[PDB]
Coordinates of C-alpha atoms and ligand atoms in Angstrom, one line a residue:
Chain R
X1 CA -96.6 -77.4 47.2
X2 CA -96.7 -74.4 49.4
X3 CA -94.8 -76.0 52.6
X4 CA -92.9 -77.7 50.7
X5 CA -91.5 -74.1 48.7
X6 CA -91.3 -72.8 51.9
X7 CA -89.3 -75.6 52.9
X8 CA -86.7 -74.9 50.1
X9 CA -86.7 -70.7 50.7
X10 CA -86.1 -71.3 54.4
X11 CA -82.6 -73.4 53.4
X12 CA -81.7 -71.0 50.9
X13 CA -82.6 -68.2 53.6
X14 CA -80.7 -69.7 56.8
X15 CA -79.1 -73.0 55.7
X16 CA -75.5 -72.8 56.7
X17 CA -72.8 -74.0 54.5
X18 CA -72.2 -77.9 54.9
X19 CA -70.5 -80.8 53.0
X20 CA -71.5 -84.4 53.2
X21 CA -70.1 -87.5 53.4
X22 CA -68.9 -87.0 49.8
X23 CA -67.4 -83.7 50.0
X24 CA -70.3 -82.2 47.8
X25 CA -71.3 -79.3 49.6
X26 CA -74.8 -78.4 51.3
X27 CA -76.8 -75.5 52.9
X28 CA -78.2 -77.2 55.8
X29 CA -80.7 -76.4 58.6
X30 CA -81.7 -78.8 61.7
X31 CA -85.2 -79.0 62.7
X32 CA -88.1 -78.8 60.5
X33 CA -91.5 -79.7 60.6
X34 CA -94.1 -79.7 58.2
X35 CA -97.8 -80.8 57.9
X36 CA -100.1 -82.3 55.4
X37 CA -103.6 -83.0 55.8
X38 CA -104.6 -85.7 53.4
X39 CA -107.9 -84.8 53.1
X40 CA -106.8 -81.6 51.5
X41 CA -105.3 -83.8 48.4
X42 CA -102.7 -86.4 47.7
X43 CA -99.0 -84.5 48.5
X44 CA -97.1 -85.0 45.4
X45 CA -95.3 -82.0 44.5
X46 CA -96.9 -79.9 41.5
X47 CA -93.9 -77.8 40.6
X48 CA -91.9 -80.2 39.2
X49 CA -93.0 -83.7 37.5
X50 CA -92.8 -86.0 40.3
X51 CA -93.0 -89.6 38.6
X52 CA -94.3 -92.4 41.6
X53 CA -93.6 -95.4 39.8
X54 CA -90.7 -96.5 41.4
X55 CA -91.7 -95.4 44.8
X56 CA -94.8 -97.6 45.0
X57 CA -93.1 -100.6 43.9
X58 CA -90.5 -99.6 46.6
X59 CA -93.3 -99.4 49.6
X60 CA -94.7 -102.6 48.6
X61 CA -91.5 -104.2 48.6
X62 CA -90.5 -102.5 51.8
X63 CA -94.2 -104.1 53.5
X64 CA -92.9 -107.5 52.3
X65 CA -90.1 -107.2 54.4
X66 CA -87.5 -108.0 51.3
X67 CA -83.9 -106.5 51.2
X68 CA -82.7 -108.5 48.1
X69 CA -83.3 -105.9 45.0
X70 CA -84.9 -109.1 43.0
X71 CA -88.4 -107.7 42.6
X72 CA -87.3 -104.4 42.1
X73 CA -85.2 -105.5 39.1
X74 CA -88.2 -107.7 38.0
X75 CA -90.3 -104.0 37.4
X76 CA -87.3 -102.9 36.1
X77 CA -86.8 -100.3 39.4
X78 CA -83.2 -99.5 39.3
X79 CA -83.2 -96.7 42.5
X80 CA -81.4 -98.9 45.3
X81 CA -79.3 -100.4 42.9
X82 CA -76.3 -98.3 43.2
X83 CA -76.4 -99.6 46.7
X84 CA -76.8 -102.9 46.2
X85 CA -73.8 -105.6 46.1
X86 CA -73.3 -108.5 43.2
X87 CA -76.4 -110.7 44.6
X88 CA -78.7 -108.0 44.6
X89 CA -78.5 -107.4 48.6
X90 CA -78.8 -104.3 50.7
X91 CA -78.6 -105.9 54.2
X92 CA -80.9 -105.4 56.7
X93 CA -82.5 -101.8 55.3
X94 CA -85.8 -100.9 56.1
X95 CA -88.1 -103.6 54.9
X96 CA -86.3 -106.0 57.0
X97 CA -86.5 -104.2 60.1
X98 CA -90.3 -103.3 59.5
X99 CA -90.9 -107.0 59.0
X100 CA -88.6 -109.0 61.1
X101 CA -86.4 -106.7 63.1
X102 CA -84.7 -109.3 65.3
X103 CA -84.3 -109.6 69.0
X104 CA -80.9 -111.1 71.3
X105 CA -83.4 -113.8 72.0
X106 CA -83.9 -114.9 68.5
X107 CA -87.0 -113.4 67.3
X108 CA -88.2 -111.6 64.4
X109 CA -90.4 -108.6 65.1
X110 CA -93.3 -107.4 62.4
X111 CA -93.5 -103.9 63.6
X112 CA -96.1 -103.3 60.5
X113 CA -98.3 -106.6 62.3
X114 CA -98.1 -104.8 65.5
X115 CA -98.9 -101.6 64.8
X116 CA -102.5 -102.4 62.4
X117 CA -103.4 -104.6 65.3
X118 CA -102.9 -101.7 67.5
X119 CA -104.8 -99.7 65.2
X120 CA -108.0 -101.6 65.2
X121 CA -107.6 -102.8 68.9
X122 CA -106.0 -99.7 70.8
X123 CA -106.6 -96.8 68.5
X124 CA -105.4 -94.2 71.9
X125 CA -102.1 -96.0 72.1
X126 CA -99.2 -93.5 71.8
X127 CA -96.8 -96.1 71.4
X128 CA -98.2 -97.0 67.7
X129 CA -94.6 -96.9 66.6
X130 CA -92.2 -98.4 63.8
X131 CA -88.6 -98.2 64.0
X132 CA -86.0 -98.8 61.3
X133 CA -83.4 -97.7 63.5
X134 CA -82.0 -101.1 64.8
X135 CA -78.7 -100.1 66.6
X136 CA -77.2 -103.6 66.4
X137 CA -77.6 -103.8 62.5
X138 CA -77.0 -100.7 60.8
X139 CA -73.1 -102.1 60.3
X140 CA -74.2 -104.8 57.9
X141 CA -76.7 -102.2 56.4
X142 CA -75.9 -100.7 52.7
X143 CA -77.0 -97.6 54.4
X144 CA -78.5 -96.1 57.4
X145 CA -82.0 -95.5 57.3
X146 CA -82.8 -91.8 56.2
X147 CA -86.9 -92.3 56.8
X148 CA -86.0 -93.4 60.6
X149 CA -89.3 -94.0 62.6
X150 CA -93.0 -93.1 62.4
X151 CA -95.6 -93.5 64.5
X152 CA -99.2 -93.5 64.2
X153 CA -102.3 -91.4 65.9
X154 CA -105.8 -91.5 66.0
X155 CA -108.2 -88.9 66.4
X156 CA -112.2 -88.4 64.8
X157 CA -111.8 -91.7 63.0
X158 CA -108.7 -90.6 61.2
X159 CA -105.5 -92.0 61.3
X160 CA -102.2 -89.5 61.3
X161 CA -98.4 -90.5 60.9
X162 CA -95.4 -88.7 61.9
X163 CA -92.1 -89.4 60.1
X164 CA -88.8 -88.5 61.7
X165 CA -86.3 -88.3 58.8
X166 CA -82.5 -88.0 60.3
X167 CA -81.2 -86.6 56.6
X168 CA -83.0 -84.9 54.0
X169 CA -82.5 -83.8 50.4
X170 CA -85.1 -81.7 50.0
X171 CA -84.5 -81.6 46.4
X172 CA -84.1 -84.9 44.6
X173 CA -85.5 -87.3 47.8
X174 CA -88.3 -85.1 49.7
X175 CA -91.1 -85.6 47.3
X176 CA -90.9 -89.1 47.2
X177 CA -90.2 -88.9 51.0
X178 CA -93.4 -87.4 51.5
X179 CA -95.3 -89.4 48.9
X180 CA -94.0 -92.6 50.0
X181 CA -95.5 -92.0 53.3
X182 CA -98.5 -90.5 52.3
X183 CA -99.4 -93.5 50.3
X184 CA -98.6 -95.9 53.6
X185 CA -101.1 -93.6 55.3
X186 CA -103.5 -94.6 52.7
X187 CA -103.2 -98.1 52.3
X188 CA -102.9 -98.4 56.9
X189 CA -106.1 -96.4 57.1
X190 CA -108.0 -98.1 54.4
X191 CA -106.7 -101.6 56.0
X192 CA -108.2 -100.1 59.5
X193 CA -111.6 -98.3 58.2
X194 CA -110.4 -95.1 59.2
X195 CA -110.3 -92.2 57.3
X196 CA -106.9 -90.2 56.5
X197 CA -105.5 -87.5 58.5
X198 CA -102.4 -85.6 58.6
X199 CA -98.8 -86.6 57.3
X200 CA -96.2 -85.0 59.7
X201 CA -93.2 -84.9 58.7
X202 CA -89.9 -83.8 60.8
X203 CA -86.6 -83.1 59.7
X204 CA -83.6 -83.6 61.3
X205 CA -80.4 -82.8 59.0
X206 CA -82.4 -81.1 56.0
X207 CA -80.0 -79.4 53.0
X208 CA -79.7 -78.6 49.7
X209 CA -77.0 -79.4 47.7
X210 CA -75.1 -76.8 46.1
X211 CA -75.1 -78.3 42.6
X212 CA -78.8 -77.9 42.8
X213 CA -79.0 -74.4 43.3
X214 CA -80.0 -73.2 40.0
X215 CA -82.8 -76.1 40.0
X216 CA -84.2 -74.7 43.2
X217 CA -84.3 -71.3 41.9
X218 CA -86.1 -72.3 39.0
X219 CA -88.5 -74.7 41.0
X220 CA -89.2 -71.4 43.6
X221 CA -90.3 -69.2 40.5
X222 CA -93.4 -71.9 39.7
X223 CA -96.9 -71.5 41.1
X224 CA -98.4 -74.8 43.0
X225 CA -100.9 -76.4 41.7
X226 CA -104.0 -77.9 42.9
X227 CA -103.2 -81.5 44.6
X228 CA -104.2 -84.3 42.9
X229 CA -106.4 -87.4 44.3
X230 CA -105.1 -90.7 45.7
X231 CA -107.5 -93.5 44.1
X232 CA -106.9 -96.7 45.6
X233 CA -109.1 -99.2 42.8
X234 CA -109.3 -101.8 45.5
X235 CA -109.4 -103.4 48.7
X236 CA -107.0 -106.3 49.9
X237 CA -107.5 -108.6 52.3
X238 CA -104.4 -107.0 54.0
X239 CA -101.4 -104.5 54.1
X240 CA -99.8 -107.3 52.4
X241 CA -101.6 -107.6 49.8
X242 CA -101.8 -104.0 47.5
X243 CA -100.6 -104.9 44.5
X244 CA -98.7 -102.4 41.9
X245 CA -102.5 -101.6 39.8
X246 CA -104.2 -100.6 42.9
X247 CA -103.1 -97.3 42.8
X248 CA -104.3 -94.3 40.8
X249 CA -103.0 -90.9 40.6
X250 CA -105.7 -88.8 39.4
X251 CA -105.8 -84.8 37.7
X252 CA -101.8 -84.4 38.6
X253 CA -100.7 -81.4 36.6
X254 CA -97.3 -80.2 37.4
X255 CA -94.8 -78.1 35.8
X256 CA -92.0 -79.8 33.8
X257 CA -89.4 -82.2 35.4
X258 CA -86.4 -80.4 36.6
X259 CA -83.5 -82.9 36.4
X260 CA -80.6 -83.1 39.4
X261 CA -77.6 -84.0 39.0
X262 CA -75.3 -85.8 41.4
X263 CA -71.5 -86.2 41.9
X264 CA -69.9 -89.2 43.0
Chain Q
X1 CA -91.4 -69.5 78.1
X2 CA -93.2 -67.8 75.5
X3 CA -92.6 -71.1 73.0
X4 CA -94.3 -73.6 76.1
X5 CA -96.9 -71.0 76.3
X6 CA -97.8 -71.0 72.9
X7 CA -97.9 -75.2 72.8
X8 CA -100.3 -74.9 76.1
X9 CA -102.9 -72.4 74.5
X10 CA -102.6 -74.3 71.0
X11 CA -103.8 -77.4 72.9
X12 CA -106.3 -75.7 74.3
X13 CA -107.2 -74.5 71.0
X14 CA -107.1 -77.3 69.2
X15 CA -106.3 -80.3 71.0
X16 CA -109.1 -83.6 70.7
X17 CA -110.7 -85.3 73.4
X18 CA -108.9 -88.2 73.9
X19 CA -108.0 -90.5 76.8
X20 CA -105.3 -92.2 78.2
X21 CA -104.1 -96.0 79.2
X22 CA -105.6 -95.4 82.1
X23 CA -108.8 -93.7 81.4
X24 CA -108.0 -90.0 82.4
X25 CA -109.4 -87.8 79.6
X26 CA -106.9 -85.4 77.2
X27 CA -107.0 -82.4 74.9
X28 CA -104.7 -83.8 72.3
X29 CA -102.5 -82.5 69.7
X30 CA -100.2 -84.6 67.2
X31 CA -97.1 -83.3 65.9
X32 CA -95.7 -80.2 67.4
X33 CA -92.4 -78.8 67.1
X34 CA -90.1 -75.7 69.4
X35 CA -86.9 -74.5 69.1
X36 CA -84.7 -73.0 71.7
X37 CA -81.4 -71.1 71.4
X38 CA -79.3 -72.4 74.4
X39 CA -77.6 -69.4 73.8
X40 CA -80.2 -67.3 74.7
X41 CA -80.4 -68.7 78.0
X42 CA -81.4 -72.1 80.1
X43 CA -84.8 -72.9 78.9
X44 CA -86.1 -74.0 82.5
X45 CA -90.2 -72.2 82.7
X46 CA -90.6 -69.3 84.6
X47 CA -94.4 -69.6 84.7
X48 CA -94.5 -71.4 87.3
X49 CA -91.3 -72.8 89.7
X50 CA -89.8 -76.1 88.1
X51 CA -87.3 -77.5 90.5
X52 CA -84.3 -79.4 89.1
X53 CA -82.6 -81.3 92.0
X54 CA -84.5 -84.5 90.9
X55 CA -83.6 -83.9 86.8
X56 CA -80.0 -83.8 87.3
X57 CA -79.7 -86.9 89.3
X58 CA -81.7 -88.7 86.8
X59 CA -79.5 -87.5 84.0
X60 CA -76.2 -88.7 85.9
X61 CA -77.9 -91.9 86.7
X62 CA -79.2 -91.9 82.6
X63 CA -76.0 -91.5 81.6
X64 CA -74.5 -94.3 83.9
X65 CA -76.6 -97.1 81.8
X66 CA -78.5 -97.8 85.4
X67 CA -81.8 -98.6 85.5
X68 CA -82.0 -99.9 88.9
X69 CA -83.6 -97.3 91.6
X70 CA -81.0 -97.6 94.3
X71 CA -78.8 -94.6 92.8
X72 CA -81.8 -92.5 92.9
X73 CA -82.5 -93.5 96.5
X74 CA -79.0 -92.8 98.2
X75 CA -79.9 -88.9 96.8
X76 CA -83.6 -89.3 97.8
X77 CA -85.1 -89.5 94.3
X78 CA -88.2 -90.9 93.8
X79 CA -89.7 -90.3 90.5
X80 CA -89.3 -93.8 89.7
X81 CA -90.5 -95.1 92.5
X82 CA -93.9 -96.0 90.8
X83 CA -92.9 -98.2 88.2
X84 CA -89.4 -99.8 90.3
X85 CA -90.7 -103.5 91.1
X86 CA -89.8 -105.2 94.6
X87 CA -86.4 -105.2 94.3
X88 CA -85.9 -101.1 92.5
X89 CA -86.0 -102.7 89.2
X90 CA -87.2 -101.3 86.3
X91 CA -85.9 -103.3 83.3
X92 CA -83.9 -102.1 80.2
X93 CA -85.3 -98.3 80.5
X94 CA -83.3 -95.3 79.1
X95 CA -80.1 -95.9 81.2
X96 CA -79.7 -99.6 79.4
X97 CA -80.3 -98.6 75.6
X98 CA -78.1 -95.3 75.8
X99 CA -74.9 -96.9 77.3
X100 CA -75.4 -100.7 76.3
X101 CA -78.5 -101.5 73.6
X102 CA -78.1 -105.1 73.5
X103 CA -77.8 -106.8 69.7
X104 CA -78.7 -109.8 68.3
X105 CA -75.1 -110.9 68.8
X106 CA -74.3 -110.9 71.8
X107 CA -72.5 -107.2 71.8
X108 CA -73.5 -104.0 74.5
X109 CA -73.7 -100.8 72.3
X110 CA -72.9 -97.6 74.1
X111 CA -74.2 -95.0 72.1
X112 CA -73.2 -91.9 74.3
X113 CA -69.5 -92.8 73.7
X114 CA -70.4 -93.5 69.9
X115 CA -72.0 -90.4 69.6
X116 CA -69.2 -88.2 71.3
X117 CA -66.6 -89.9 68.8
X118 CA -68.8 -88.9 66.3
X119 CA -68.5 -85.3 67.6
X120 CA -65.2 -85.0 67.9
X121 CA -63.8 -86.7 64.6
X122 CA -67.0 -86.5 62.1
X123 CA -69.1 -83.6 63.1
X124 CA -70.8 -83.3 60.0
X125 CA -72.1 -87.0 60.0
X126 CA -75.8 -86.7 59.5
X127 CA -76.3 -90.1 61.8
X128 CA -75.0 -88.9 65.0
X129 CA -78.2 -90.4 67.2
X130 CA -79.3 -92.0 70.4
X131 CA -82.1 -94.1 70.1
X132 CA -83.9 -96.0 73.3
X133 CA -86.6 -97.6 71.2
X134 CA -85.3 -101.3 71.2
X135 CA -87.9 -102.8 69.7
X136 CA -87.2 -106.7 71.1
X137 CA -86.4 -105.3 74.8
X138 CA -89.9 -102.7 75.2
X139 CA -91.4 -105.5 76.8
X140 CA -89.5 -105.7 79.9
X141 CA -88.9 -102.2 80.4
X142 CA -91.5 -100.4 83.2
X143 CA -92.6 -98.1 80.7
X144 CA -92.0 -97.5 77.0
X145 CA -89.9 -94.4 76.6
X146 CA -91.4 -91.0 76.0
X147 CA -88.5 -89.3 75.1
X148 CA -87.6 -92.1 72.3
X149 CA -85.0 -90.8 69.7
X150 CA -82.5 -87.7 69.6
X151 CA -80.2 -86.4 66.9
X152 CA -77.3 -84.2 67.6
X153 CA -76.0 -81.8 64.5
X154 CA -72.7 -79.5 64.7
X155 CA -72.8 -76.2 62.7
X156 CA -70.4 -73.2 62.8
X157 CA -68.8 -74.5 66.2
X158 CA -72.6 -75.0 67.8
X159 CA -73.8 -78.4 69.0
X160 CA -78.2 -78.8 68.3
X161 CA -79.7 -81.5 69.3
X162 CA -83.3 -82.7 68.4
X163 CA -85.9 -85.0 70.3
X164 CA -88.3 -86.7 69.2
X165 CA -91.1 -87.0 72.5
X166 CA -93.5 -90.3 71.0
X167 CA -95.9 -89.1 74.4
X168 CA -95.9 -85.6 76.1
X169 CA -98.1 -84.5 79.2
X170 CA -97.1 -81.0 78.3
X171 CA -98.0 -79.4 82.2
X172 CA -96.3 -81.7 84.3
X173 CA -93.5 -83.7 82.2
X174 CA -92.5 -81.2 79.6
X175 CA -90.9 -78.8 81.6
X176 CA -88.7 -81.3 82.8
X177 CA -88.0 -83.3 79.5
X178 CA -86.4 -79.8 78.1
X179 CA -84.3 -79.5 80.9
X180 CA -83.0 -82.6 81.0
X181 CA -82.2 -82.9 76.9
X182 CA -81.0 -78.8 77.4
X183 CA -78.5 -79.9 80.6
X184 CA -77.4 -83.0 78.5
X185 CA -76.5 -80.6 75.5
X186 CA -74.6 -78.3 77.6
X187 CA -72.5 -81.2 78.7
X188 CA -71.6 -82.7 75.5
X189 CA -70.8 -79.5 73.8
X190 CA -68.7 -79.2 76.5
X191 CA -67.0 -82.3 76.1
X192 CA -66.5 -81.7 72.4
X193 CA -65.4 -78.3 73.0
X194 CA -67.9 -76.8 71.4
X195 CA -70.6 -74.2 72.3
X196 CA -74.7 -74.6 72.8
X197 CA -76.2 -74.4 69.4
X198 CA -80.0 -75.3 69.6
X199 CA -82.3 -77.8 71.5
X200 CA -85.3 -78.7 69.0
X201 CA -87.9 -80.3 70.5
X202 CA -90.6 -82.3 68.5
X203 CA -93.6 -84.2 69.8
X204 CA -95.7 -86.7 69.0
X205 CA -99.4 -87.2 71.0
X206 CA -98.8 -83.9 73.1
X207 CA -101.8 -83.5 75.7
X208 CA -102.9 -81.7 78.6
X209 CA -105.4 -83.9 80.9
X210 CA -108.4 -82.4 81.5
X211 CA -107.8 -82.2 85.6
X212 CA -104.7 -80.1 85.0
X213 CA -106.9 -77.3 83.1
X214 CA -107.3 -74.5 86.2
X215 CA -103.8 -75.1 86.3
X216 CA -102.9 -74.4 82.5
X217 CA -105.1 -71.2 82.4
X218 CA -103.5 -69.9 85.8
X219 CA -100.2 -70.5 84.1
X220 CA -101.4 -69.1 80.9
X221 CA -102.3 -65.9 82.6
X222 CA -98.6 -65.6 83.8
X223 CA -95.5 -63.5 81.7
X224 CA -92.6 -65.6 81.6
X225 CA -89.8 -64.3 83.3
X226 CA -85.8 -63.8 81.7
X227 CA -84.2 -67.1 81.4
X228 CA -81.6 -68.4 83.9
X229 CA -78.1 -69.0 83.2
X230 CA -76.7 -72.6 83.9
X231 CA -73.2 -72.4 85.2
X232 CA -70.4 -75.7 84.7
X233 CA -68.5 -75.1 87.8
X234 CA -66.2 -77.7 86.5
X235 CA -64.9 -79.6 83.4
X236 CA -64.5 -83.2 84.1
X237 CA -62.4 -85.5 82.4
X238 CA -65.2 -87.6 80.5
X239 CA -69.1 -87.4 80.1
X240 CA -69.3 -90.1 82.7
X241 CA -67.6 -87.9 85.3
X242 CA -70.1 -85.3 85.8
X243 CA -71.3 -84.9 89.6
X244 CA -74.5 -83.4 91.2
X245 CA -72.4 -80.9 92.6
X246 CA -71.0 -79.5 89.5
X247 CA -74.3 -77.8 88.3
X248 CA -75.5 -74.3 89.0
X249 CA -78.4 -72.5 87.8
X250 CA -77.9 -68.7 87.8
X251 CA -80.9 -65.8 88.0
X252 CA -83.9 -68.0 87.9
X253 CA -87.0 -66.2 89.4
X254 CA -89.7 -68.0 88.6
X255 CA -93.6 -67.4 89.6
X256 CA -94.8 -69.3 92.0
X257 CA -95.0 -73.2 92.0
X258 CA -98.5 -74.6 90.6
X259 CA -99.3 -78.8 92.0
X260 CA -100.7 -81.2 89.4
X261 CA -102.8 -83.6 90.8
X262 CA -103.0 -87.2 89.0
X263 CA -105.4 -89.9 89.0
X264 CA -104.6 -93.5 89.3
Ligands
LIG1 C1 -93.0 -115.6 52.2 C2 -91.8 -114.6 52.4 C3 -92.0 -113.2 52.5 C4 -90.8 -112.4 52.7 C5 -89.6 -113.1 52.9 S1 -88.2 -112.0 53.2 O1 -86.8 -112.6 53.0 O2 -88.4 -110.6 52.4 N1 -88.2 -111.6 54.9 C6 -89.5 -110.9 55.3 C7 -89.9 -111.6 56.6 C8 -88.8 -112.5 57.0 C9 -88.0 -112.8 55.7 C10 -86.5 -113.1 55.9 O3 -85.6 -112.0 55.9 O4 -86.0 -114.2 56.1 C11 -89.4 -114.4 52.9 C12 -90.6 -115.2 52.6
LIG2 C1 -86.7 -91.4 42.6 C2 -86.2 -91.5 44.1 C3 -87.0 -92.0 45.1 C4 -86.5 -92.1 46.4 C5 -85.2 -91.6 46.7 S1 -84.6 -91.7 48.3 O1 -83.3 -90.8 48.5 O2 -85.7 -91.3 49.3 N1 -84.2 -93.4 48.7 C6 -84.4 -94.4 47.6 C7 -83.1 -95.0 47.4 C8 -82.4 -95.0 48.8 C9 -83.0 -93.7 49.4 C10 -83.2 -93.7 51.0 O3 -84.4 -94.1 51.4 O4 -82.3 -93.5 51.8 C11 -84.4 -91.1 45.7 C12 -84.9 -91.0 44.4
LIG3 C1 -69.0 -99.9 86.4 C2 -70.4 -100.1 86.1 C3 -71.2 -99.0 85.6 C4 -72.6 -99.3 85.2 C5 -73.1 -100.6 85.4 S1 -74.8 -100.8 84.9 O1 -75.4 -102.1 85.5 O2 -75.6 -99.5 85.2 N1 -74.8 -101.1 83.2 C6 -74.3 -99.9 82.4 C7 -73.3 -100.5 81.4 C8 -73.6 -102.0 81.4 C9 -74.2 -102.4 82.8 C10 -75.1 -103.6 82.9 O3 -76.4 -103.4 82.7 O4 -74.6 -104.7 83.2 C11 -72.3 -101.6 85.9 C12 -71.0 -101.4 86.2
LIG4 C1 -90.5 -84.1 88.4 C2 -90.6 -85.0 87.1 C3 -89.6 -85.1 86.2 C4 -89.8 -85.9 85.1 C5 -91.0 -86.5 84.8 S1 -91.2 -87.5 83.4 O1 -92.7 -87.8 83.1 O2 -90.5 -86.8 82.2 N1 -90.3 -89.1 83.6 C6 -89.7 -89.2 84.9 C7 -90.3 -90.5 85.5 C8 -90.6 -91.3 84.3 C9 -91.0 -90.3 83.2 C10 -90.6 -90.7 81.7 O3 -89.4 -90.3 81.2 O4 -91.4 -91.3 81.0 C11 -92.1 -86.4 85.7 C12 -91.9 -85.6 86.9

């Protein structure tokens, strides 16, 4: 997509050079922002098959508030399992804290409750906020969140979302990053009666990785194509409720795959 | 500053009407994002004359883990007057979450010393954040945090530091918010030994309310001055150790002051 191109130039252009964790080296920048507006078209990236399979099964799971990889391996959705230990758990990722982030006094927050009841009863709030950044867990967590915190805004019966994402790799996990959320955005308006808006999202570390340097260039020499459309085939009873067939990705015509290779 | 300018007039331009908790009518915007290069200067506005006594105690008192107003009186400052209950209390604010987040547990977190370990032994983590959304405490604090989140990053031998602003009154609070996160930088890069690399500032519902709109086009019609020069007149052993005292702010000529009248 065209910010999202730009996105990739702008590393290339002023990312300064930076290993990770690993010792696989990056170009990295700090501080990005770029906007979507939903009504324009449903942000999965045209210039390179983007399959969202795996990352709808993961939002759903996430909205259950499930850490165990269990249902993922029932859909045979194999993406956190490198993460995950013999029993199939992650900790207390994302979907946990979303859920049931808990409290020194014993209780289990459901940010995602909170906020849709917000949405319908205090639509000017500007504290219509989820966090997965729980300080006191991210020890026992398989990883810390990337996709931190988001919050929600209303405007001319839309509903927006801002994501703050600490790390970014803007070529294998941005487009499901920005899909992911996209698709939340959906599913929370549709649950509210609102019409979509804009995804924000922000960047905090954002990099490429040097092994996928050759990809990138290859990816920057394709044209954009038109953004497909979001169907949604029905409409549950709640957020909790979308189930996998809901969702329809219609006239999505990208250029081929590109394939991105990791070290470990 | 020519980047504040350019939010002002883009609310202006494009901002929604929308009102607050209270019922004062906004122009709103969501999703904004600045960058300043510390080493161009101290980003304090010129437009209009932004005083900084009142900042820097609140920082030093921040940074304490305080949230109880009597600090802030022995010095005479009273910006928290309004929300400090009988006794100067203003429950488990910013102070509380940065230097002791309480967990599930049992355990005090003090992310300011975690974050400074980070800088000096991993400065390429891609985690190094503060965060002062506690989900299970926001109900006792006075007030939810604006100024929520914030991300350091270390890159060729500069320390950046992001913040993500959930709610911005961009006339009277802003000016102040990137002083404060701009002062703090200095001080940690100093700490770490390191120099100023960038303050990135990103918001979230970023107004202007509609009484404070002679003043934003008085201040619109304004050049911004050269930016002033902070001066460290000392290096103290700790980032605990900083005193009022110790901070100087060099060539600031500002035009003149400009009131902001708010309704209750
Ligand atoms: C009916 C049900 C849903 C989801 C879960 S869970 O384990 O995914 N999780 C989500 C909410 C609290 C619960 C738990 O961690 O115990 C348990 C039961
Ligand atoms: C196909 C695919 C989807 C999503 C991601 S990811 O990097 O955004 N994500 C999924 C696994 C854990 C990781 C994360 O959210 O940190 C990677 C690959
Ligand atoms: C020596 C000292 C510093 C700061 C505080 S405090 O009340 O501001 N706060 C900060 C760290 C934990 C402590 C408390 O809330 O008990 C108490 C004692
Ligand atoms: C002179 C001045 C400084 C700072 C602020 S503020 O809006 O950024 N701040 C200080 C009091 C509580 C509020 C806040 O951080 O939410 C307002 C006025």
């Amino acid at each position: 997509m065209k910010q999202y191109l730009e996105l990739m130039q702008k590393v290339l252009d002023e990312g300064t050079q930076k290993n990770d964790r690993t010792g696989t080296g990056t170009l990295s920048i700090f501080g990005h922002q770029m906007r979507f507006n939903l009504q324009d078209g449903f942000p999965l990236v045209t210039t390179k098959r983007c399959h969202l399979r795996s990352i709808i099964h993961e939002l759903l799971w996430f909205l259950q508030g499930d850490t165990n990889i269990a249902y993922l391996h029932e859909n045979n959705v194999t993406i956190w399992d490198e993460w995950a230990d013999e029993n199939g758990d992650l900790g207390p990722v994302y979907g946990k804290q979303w859920r049931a982030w808990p409290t020194p006094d014993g209780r289990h927050i459901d940010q995602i409750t909170t906020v849709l009841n917000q949405l319908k009863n205090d639509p000017d709030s500007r504290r219509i906020i989820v966090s997965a950044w729980n300080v006191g867990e991210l020890d026992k967590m398989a990883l810390a969140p990337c996709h931190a915190f988001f919050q929600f805004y209303v405007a001319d019966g839309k509903l927006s979302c801002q994501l703050y994402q600490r790390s970014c790799d803007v070529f294998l996990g941005l487009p499901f990053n920005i899909a992911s959320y996209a698709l939340l955005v959906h599913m929370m308006a549709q649950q509210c009666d609102l019409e979509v808006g804009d995804f924000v999202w922000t960047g905090g570390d954002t990099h490429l990785y040097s092994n996928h340097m050759d990809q990138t260039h290859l990816q920057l020499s394709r044209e954009p194509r038109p953004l497909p459309k979001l169907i949604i085939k029905r409409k549950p009873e709640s957020i909790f409720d979308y189930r996998f067939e809901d969702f329809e990705i219609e006239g999505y015509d990208p250029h081929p795959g590109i394939k991105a290779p990791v070290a470990i």
